[PDB]
Ligand binder design. Structure first.
Ligand SMILES: OC[C@H]1O[C@@](CO)(O[C@H]2O[C@H](CO)[C@@H](O)[C@H](O)[C@H]2O)[C@@H](O)[C@@H]1O
Ligand SMILES: *C/C=C(\C)CC/C=C(\C)CC/C=C(\C)CCC=C(C)C
Ligand SMILES: [Zn+2]
Lengths: 410, 4, 315
């Protein structure tokens, strides 16, 4: 085989050049943009090859850590556009640190808890900042952040009685949920609601009545899921849809065959990463939204007794995704991003890392099989495919809240 | 990439 | 009146007409986290927004203030909600507000709040007369804007404006036949008008799609649409399609065509086709070709399909 200091890469194989776009001599905006990205990516790939010498890939953990540590405390005015998503920023940063196995000082943990408490609304749920109306996005993020901290102090911050009332206040008769009072409706809400309701043990038999059916209506001719019935299949909305159904134990409401074929088709043959929609560009954040669907589908099919399922790999190219993330999505100054040429941000840092962890770790039943590309130190902590926080954090939180009654219900 |  | 970037703009803390109300600072706690270092102008507007919101002041000055708050952060849904409360309380001219949201969306077309606000206005007015044209302009700038397409489907379905959408679809497909959002709109229009059960309509669509495939063999959208309109009844229910694809294979053995053949074989085996052993063998051979050479990025998927086929039809 190869010496330990050289590791052959899929993206560097000579035959990999055959995977370049074939535009059939018919140019459109779509093919032109795709070709431009592939050209840049090939240049990047080649920079990691020195003829037969191919040094192991390195995740710049320390650089990422310092960037995250600073962001958790202060942000430049460049983030004014996210002033209504602060609990969300907290989650992105904390989950990134969690994946990197970077401890959270007790003081920082308490400060986060106090801040999220200030974001909690008297009517239930959390807003994008102190005094803001509650919204399912920051609510989902706040709950996840508190669970990552995992202390009784963090858990108890959540006003469970009002949270359940708040979810009821957003529930529509057709099974869908508004993102906030007087707000828009799409599959993101069903996932946010299912996520926080299941973690905090506040699910009632009627809360999600009709929700599974509404989500199934969102799956389209492509096999993927759109934001609302009729819309184009999209990785973000598909993750939300399937994850919510898994929580509701209603995955069978979907055509899992067309969904599986659709998501696997979203991995780019040349880049190795995933696109959000068919015929659109690769993007590091879809490393999670799309790739995260494979562990969910694996579980779904496994529950059905599928005898053909792998006992060692997810149904996507785990190595290629790792190659795309490690070679193309790291900012030398720390942080991760969409693709070469784009600037870093905490959102991409969170999801590029989340996707990398999914690609490195396979687990099913009593079987565990890791594939950590590059130096061993690249190994990230595992992440739960449904909630996207540590599996340990999920178990600890669910066990804690299961000891509490469902607010005003039996 | 806006989520909300 | 005056915009945030206008030379004569004055901070709210310096406006005489606002002197009677005390600004309300944001309480982030003594030891802040994810603390944004706001500009003086940003904080000024929001300190006063918090004041009017806290006092629930349904006034014209409050209404004008939300405009600046929105320019500073159009993603602040709390401001948008309050602005709508004011629109009703003050009985503001909704057509004037439509012109406002039109300009706002043009500036920030990928924002959730602006499109929802527009939908609310259209619902309040029950006036969709400007929608299709406005949306077309947004799509002329970004033909794949998700929010634009979503709003377009809502308007068409809610106000029954189906008459010219297929023509619009054909127009955009001519501009970029690889635009997946347009192929989706195509399915949206047909399934909601004639439906696909009309065999004349289905044949028209299959013919059209095959022609697009011949023009651009590696455009995945057309292949996905072809499978999309035939999958529910079953790919094996269309015997002539298999023959036609097999004839094009030798000259167009793209991974899309090869994968489509496997999809057909899968369905055939699922419907007690004749020559089961032969079909299974052909399907397994293609799965290997896809996994090892033609579609290696999906090696695990194709290996899975190979094993699935054997678990279901070996005998
Ligand atoms: O992926 C197709 C698969 O999705 C379902 C919903 O689970 O239906 C979707 O796709 C159909 C076209 O194949 C549309 O007619 C339908 O409106 C859309 O929801 C399944 O019925 C189908 O097998
Ligand atoms: C480039 C990225 C884009 C356009 C966004 C796509 C991702 C989507 C739609 C997923 C949204 C998921 C949600 C809202 C669940 C809640 C998530 C958080 C609070 C972080
Ligand atoms: Zn992205």
């Amino acid at each position: 085989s190869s010496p330990v200091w050289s590791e052959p890469l899929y993206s560097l194989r000579p035959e990999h050049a055959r995977e370049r776009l074939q535009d059939d001599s018919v140019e459109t905006v779509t093919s032109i943009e795709q070709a431009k990205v592939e050209e840049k990516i090939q240049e990047v790939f080649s920079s990691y090859k020195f003829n037969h010498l191919v040094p192991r890939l390195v995740l710049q953990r320390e650089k990422h850590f310092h960037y995250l540590k600073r962001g958790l405390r202060q942000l430049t005015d460049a983030y004014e556009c996210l002033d209504a998503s602060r609990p969300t920023l907290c989650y992105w940063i904390l989950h990134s640190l969690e994946l990197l196995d970077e401890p959270i000082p007790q003081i920082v943990a308490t400060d986060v808890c106090q801040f999220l408490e200030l974001c909690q609304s008297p009517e239930g749920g959390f807003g994008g900042g102190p005094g803001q109306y509650p919204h399912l996005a920051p609510t989902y993020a706040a709950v996840n952040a508190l669970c990552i901290i995992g202390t009784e102090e963090a858990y108890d911050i959540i006003n469970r009685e009002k949270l359940l009332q708040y979810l009821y206040s957003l529930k529509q008769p057709d099974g869908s949920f508004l993102m906030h009072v007087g707000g828009e409706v799409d599959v993101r809400s069903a996932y946010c609601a299912a996520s926080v309701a299941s973690l905090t043990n506040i699910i009632t038999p009627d809360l999600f009545e009709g929700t599974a059916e509404w989500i199934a209506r969102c799956q389209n001719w492509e096999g993927g899921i759109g934001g609302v019935p009729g819309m184009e299949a999209h990785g973000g909305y598909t993750f939300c849809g399937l994850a919510a159904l898994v929580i509701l134990k209603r995955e069978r409401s979907l055509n899992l065959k067309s969904l599986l074929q659709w998501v696997t088709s979203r991995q780019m043959r040349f880049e190795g990463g995933f696109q959000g929609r068919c015929n659109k560009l690769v993007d590091g954040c879809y490393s999670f939204w799309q790739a995260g669907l494979l562990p969910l589908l694996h579980r779904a099919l496994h529950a059905q007794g599928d005898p053909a399922l792998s006992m060692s790999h997810w149904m996507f190219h785990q190595q290629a995704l790792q190659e795309y993330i490690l070679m193309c999505c790291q900012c030398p100054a720390g942080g991760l991003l969409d693709k070469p040429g784009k600037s870093r941000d905490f959102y991409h840092t969170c999801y590029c890392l989340s996707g990398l962890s999914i690609a490195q770790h396979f687990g099913s039943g009593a079987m565990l099989h890791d594939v950590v590309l590059g130096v061993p130190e690249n190994a990230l902590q595992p992440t739960h495919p449904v909630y996207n926080i540590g599996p340990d954090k999920v178990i600890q939180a669910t066990t804690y809240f299961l000891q509490k009654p469902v607010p005003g219900f039996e | 990439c806006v989520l909300s | 009146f005056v915009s945030l970037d206008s030379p004569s703009y004055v901070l709210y803390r310096d406006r005489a007409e606002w002197a009677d109300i005390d600004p309300v600072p944001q309480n982030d706690g003594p030891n802040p986290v994810v603390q944004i270092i706001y500009s003086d102008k940003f904080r000024d507007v929001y300190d006063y927004f918090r004041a009017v919101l806290q006092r629930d002041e349904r006034s014209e000055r409050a209404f004008k203030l939300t405009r600046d708050a929105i320019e500073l952060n159009a993603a602040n849904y709390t401001v948008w909600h309050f602005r709508r409360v004011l629109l009703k309380s003050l009985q503001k001219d909704l057509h004037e507000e439509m012109n406002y949201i039109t300009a706002i969306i043009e500036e920030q077309p990928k924002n959730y709040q602006v499109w929802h606000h527009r939908r609310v206005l259209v619902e309040w007015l029950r006036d969709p007369s400007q929608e299709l044209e406005f949306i077309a302009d947004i799509l002329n700038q970004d033909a794949k804007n998700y929010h634009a397409w979503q709003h377009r489907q809502w308007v068409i379905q809610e106000f029954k404006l189906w008459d010219n959408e297929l023509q619009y679809v054909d127009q955009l497909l001519k501009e970029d036949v690889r635009n997946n959002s347009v192929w989706n709109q195509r399915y949206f229009v047909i399934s909601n008008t004639t439906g696909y059960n009309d065999r004349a309509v289905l044949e028209r669509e299959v013919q059209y799609t095959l022609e697009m495939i011949k023009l651009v063999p590696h455009n995945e959208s057309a292949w996905n649409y072809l499978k999309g309109i035939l999958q529910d009844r079953g790919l094996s229910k269309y015997p002539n399609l298999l023959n036609q694809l097999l004839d094009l294979q030798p000259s167009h053995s793209s991974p899309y065509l090869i994968a489509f053949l496997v999809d057909i074989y899968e369905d055939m085996l699922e419907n007690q086709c004749d020559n089961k052993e032969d079909i299974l063998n052909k399907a397994l051979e293609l799965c290997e070709i896809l996994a090892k050479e033609k579609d290696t990025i999906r090696k695990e998927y194709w290996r899975y399909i190979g094993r699935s086929l054997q678990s279901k039809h070996s005998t």
